[PDB]
């Protein structure tokens, strides 16, 4: 049949134009009275996906 | 060329011959043979379908 994509990842990942992927960081939904200001400021900026995982999930995101 | 069948009804010879109109000329039915006979009108007809 047709290879099914993953509706669990498509709600967390945006595909850039050079090939990589985008992802918004973790540790940004809860208790902040612990993390400092640097620790909470520098976590408003999404980053990419490492070389590792793009080896193992390069198949579930085959289309989207 | 077309239904001038009186020229095909004499092509059940020794299999040295085989007959075909000008709409069914395929690859094999040419590559498999050595010489090819064709009337003068069939030549133009071929030169039509083949654009």
């Amino acid at each position: 049949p047709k290879q099914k994509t993953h509706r669990g990842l498509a709600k967390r990942v945006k595909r850039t134009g050079g090939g990589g992927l985008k992802r918004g960081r973790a540790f940004t939904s809860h208790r902040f009275h612990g993390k400092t200001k640097k620790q909470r400021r520098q976590l408003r900026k999404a980053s990419m996906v490492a070389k590792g995982d793009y080896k193992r999930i390069r198949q579930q995101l085959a289309r989207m | 060329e077309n239904g001038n069948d009186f020229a095909a009804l004499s092509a059940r010879n020794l299999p040295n011959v085989s007959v075909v109109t000008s709409d069914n000329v395929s690859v094999l039915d040419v590559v498999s043979a050595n010489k090819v006979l064709a009337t003068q009108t069939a030549l133009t007809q071929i030169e039509e379908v083949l654009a």
């Binding site: 993953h6 669990g8 990842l9 709600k11 967390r12 945006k14 992802r23 918004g24 960081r25 973790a26 940004t28 939904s29 995982d53 193992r56 999930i57 198949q59 579930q60 | 590559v31 498999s32």
Partner: protein, 146 residues
Amino acid sequence: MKLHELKPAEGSRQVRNRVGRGTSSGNGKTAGRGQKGQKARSGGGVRLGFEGGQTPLFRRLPKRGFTNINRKDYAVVNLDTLNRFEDGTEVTPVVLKEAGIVKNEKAGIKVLADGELTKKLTVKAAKFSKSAQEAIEAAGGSIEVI
């Protein structure tokens, strides 16, 4: 080329790999798979992306975004596509297309400003980047949001 002398294009057909036919092929007795382990039963292997026990990547990072129900994306043609209609042809989001340039006008044709045009066409589309009108009226064309 005759029937009894066929030759394929060189380097265009490989052979095969039949595994488990004798210890000289290099792939007999565990079929290129090794020793025990659930990678080596019939139909072993875990699902994709699964990670032993770790909370996998897709649950370690958060969900975000939604999708507007009525977005509209156009069918951009930049500027050099136009540069073959020499001087006065009434470029149109219609039978212009009909030339092997732009099929499937998604929601109307946009026009952009990359990178250089020297003609005097007359452009009709459904949107324009502000620099594109300046380029057109720079070479002295027209425009119409039609």
